[PDB]
Design an enzyme around this catalytic site. Structure first.
Site, PDB file in Angstrom:
ATOM      1  CD  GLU A  11      -3.040  -1.260   0.411  1.00 38.64           C
ATOM      2  OE1 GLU A  11      -3.109  -0.031  -0.211  1.00 38.64           O
ATOM      3  OE2 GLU A  11      -3.723  -1.980   0.075  1.00 38.64           O
ATOM      4  CG  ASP A  20      -8.220   3.811  -4.424  1.00 33.41           C
ATOM      5  OD1 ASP A  20      -8.794   4.330  -5.528  1.00 33.41           O
ATOM      6  OD2 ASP A  20      -8.657   3.049  -3.610  1.00 33.41           O
ATOM      7  CG  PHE A 104      -6.000  -3.781   4.292  1.00 36.71           C
ATOM      8  CD1 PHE A 104      -5.378  -3.055   3.324  1.00 36.71           C
ATOM      9  CD2 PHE A 104      -5.659  -3.485   5.718  1.00 36.71           C
ATOM     10  CE1 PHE A 104      -5.087  -1.598   3.615  1.00 36.71           C
ATOM     11  CE2 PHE A 104      -5.276  -2.006   6.094  1.00 36.71           C
ATOM     12  CZ  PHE A 104      -4.797  -1.229   4.979  1.00 36.71           C
TER      13      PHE A 104
END
Ligand SMILES: c1ccc2occc2c1
Ligand SMILES: [Cl-]
Ligand SMILES: [Cl-]
Length: 162
Positions: A11, A20, A104
C-alpha cells in the site's frame, strides 16, 4: 515478514490525501476515506477519523494508528464472517496473511465473491486456486500486487515479498 510489513509494502505510505488505483480518496497506508467524488467529503471523513482539524495532512504516527485499526478490523471481520472464517481457520499462518491482505484491499464483500477460489483453498489445492484467483477483475486491475498475493497462497512462503 508479517502482515504489517506485507501490507506496508503493498500500500505504501502517503501523508496527504491521495487517490487510490480506483480513483478514491485515501490517505496513509491504504486507508480509504470515501468513495465520494468530493474532496471536502474526504477531508471531513479524515478529520472525523483522526479527531482533529487535519487540513488533509496527517503525521506518520496518525497513519500508523489508522493502519493498526484497519488491520485489526479486517481480521475481526473475517472471524465474524460465516463464509470466511472456516476457510481462514483452515489456513497456515503465511496464507492467513494473504487472506487478510485481500480483505484489507477489497473488503469482506469483495472477497466473499471468490466462492470458487475459497473452496479450493479450503481443500488445499494450491495450484488450482492460484489459477482460479487470477481469473478476476482484481488480477487484471492490479496485476503486480495480485501476483504477489497469489504466489503467497500458492507457496505458503514470503518469497514474493523478498
Ligand atoms: C478470508 C478467508 C480466506 C480467504 O481466502 C482469500 C481471501 C480470504 C479471506
Ligand atoms: Cl476510521
Ligand atoms: Cl499492481
Amino acid at each position: 515478514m508479517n502482515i504489517f510489513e506485507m501490507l506496508r509494502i503493498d500500500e505504501g505510505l502517503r501523508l496527504k490525501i491521495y487517490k487510490d488505483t480506483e480513483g478514491y480518496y485515501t490517505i496513509g497506508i491504504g486507508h480509504l476515506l470515501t468513495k465520494s467524488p468530493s474532496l471536502n467529503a474526504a477531508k471531513s471523513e479524515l478529520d472525523k477519523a483522526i479527531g482533529r482539524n487535519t487540513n488533509g495532512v496527517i503525521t506518520k504516527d496518525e497513519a500508523e494508528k489508522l493502519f493498526n485499526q484497519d488491520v485489526d478490523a479486517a481480521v475481526r471481520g473475517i472471524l465474524r464472517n460465516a463464509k470466511l472464517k472456516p476457510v481462514y481457520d483452515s489456513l497456515d499462518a503465511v496464507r492467513r496473511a494473504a487472506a487478510i491482505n485481500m480483505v484489507f484491499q477489497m473488503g469482506e464483500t469483495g472477497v466473499a465473491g471468490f466462492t470458487n477460489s475459497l473452496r479450493m483453498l479450503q481443500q488445499k489445492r494450491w495450484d488450482e486456486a492460484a489459477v482460479n484467483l487470477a481469473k478476476s477483475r482484481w488480477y487484471n486491475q492490479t496485476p503486480n500486487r495480485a501476483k504477489r498475493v497469489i504466489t503467497t497462497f500458492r507457496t505458503g512462503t514470503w518469497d514474493a515479498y523478498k
